[PDB]
Symmetry: D3
Subunit: 133 residues, 6 copies
C-alpha cells in the first residue's frame, strides 16, 4: 500500500479534461485519500514542487504555466500506486508517450502534459508534504 | 453567472462514478470554483445541509448514508448554473428521472442517488456557506 | 424487486452494439439473473414471444428479422426493473424515441430497433418462461 | 429518405467536440453524403445561410461568431433525417435543451451552440444548395 | 480462424465492468459463438479450468474467488483470436499490464483481474470442452 | 510543425467508426488543415496513393477495397504530427497492433485496417499533393 501525489495541471482545466484524467485513475480502482483544489497555486509551492528542476532552462516557463490556471492536487492510495499511476500517466515526451496512457492519448506537448505523478517513494512523501502540509 | 453547490455522494465513490458525474458537468462547460474532498463529512454539516428534511421520516437514513463514505463538495460557476445543473441531475425518484440525466442513466434508488445540487439561488448561497465557510 | 425479460436483437449484433446496450442497463445497476446466447433463435420461440402480433401486417417481417442473426435473451433484476428498463429502451417509433434512450440514441427504424423489453409484470413472467423454461 | 444540412460550428472546433457531435449522428445510423471543411467560411455564405435572421438583433454577432473559426458542412441522409437530427440537436436555448441532446449535454449558450441542422424539407434543400452548389 | 474461451470473472460483475470488457472484444470485431451465464460456477469446474495451478499456493484463494459471484463463459471466434484476445487482456501482473489493455486500464490485483482468455491452441480446445461440453 | 495525410478507409464507414477514429486524433489536439469527402475515390488516385505497392500480390485487392466505399482524406497539422499520428494508428499487422492504438483496439485485418497515415516527411508531401492538388 503506497500513497502518491497527483497534480491535474492547468491545461486539463483549459481543455476540459479533468474528469477524463481522474476517471482513468478511478477506473483502475485507486482511492482518493486527500484532494485540494487551487484556483491558482502559489508560485513558491510550484517552485518547491519542481525544486529539482531549478537549473533547467524550462524552469521559469514551467512555473509560469503551472500558475496559469487552476490545479487539483490529489493523494491516491493503492498497492504499488506510485509506479502504477506513473505508467498510466505516460512518458513526458510526446514522441514517446504510448497510446492508452493519459499523455499518449491526450497530451501533445512536453510542457503542457496534463498531469503530474510522483516518480518514487522518496518523492511521493516529499510532494505530499508540500501540497498537504 | 451563478454559483451552485454540488455534492458527489458516497454511492458515487462506492460505484466508481465520481469522474462520470463530474465529467457530465464539465462537458456542459461549467467551471469548478471551489472543491473539497471529505473522507467522511461531519454529521453536523450534513444535518445542516439537509435541515429542511429534519422532521421527515427518511432523515436519519439520509444522514447515515451521507456519512457512510466520502463526499466531494464542489461549487460550480456558469450562466444559470443552478437550474441547468438541476436539469442534468434528474428527478429524485427513479420512476421519474429521464434517460440522459445523471440519475436517469445511473441511479436506481430514491436515496442513493449519486449527486446533490442546490435547488435555488437562496439555497445555493446557503449551502455554499455550509461547505465553504 | 422485479425481473424483466430483455432480448438483444440481431441488428445489435450486426452493428456491434451488444455491449453498448447491455452497458446502459448495467450502469443503471440492474443485475443479470439469467442469460442465453442464441446463434439463431428457433422461429417457434419467436412467434410465441410475439404472439400478440401474430395477425398484424408486420408479423412475418418481424419474425424473419428476429431469426436473421443471433440474439441474447437476458433476465434482469432490480427494483421496478420492468418499467425502468422500458424507459431506457425508448419508443418503438424513431420519430418518437427520446435522445438519451437506447432507441433514441441508436435506432433509426421501427422494426430494427435493437432491443426488446417486457412491457408488464404479466408479460415479463410470460416471456421469462418462453426463453428460460 | 431525406437529406439534411448540418454545420459543425466554430465552438465545436474550439472545444474539440467535432467527433463527439458527428459521432452522435453516426451512431444513429445516418450517412454522410457530402462534406466540406472550411478553415473560415466566407461571410457571404453565412449571411445567406442565416438570411431569415438578417434583421434580428443578434445577426452581426451570429455572423461574426460563424466566421471566428473553422466549420464543417455536412449533408446527412437517412429516413426522416431532418426531423430526427433536429431532435438530436436540442433546443437553441440552454434553459430548454434536454439532457441526452447535443446542446442539452454540451452547449451552454444560446449563440455558441455547436451545431446547425436544417429545420424543414425546404430549408434543407435551400441550405444544401448554398454549401454544396 | 480460431476459437478461444473467455471468462468474465466475478469482480467484473461486482464492479459493473461486464459490458466494458465485452465491448472491448466486440469492438475488435470478434464474434460470439457460444455464451453461458453462471450465477455461481460449480467449484469442480473451476478446479478443472485451473488444474494446471493445483499446486500453487494461491489455488484455493483463486477457486474461492471464482465462485464468489457470477461468471460468463464465452467462446469467441476470429482469425488468430487466441493470441489477439490475450493481447487485449493484458498481463496478469498489475505491475506489467499495459494501459490500453483490459487489465492495464481496469485491474489492480494479480488475482482479481476481471477476465480469463485461453493462452494457446491446446488450452483453448481444453477449456472450451470444460465450459461447453 | 508538420502536416500529414490521413485517410479514413471504407471499412470505417461500413462499421460506423469514422467519428471514433477522428475523435482519437482530435483528442490528441491535432488540427484539421484540409478535409475532403469522397463517395468513391477514383481508382487511379488510389493506385497513385499506393504506387509503392504496385508489385505486391495484394495490390489489386487493396485497390478494390479502397474504392468499395467512401473515404475521407484529411491533412492534419501539429508538431511532429507525422510520427505521432503513425503511433496512434498502430501497426498494419493485427498480430502486432497495440491495444490503445486505433488498429489495436478496432482493426482485425491486415487489409481492412480503418486508417492510413503518411509514414515520413517525404511521403506526407507526396500524398498531400495527390489528395489535395
Ligand atoms: C524534461 C522537460 C520537462 N518539462 C516540464 C514538464 C514536466 O512535467 C516537468 C517535470 O519534468 P520531469 O519530472 O522530467 O517530467 P515528468 O512530469 O514526466 O516526471 O517539467 C519541460 O517543460 N521540458 C522538458 O524538456
Ligand atoms: C423525498 C425523499 C428524499 N430522500 C433523500 C434523497 C434526497 O437526495 C434527499 C433530499 O431530498 P430532496 O431535496 O427532495 O431531493 P433532491 O436530492 O432531488 O433535491 O433526501 C429520500 O431518501 N426519500 C424520499 O422520499
Ligand atoms: C408497431 C410495430 C411493431 N413492429 C415490430 C417492432 C417491434 O419491436 C415489434 C413489437 O412491437 P411492439 O410491442 O409494439 O413494440 P416494442 O418492441 O416497443 O414493445 O414489432 C413493426 O415492425 N412495425 C410496427 O408498426
Ligand atoms: C433566437 C436566437 C438565435 N441566435 C443564433 C443562434 C442560432 O443557432 C442562430 C439561428 O437561430 P435559430 O434558427 O432560431 O436556432 P437553431 O440554430 O436552433 O435553429 O442564431 C442567437 O444568438 N440568439 C437568439 O436569441
Ligand atoms: C500467477 C498468479 C495467478 N493468480 C491467479 C490469477 C490468474 O488469472 C490465475 C491463472 O494464472 P495465470 O494463468 O498465470 O494468469 P493469466 O490469467 O494471466 O493466464 O491465477 C494469482 O492469484 N496469483 C498469482 O501469483
Ligand atoms: C503489408 C500489407 C499491406 N496491405 C495493405 C494494407 C495497408 O494499409 C496497405 C499499405 O501497406 P503498408 O504501407 O505496409 O501499411 P501501413 O498502412 O501500415 O503503412 O496495403 C495488405 O493488404 N496486406 C499486406 O500484407
Ligand atoms: Mg518527476
Ligand atoms: Mg433538495
Ligand atoms: Mg412489446
Ligand atoms: Mg434555424
Ligand atoms: Mg492461463
Ligand atoms: Mg505506408
Amino acid at each position: 500500500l503506497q500513497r502518491t501525489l497527483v497534480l491535474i495541471k492547468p491545461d486539463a482545466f483549459e481543455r476540459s479534461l479533468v474528469a477524463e484524467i481522474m476517471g482513468r485513475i478511478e477506473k483502475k480502482n485507486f482511492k482518493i485519500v486527500s484532494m485540494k483544489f487551487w484556483s491558482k497555486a502559489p508560485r513558491n509551492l510550484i517552485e518547491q514542487h519542481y525544486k529539482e528542476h531549478s537549473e533547467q532552462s524550462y524552469f521559469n516557463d514551467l512555473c509560469d504555466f503551472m500558475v496559469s490556471g487552476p490545479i487539483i492536487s490529489i493523494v491516491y492510495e493503492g498497492t504499488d500506486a506510485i509506479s502504477k499511476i506513473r505508467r498510466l500517466q505516460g512518458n513526458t515526451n510526446p514522441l514517446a508517450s504510448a497510446p492508452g496512457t493519459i499523455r499518449g492519448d491526450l497530451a501533445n506537448d512536453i510542457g503542457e502534459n496534463l498531469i503530474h505523478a510522483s516518480d518514487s517513494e522518496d518523492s511521493a512523501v516529499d510532494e505530499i508534504s508540500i501540497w498537504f502540509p
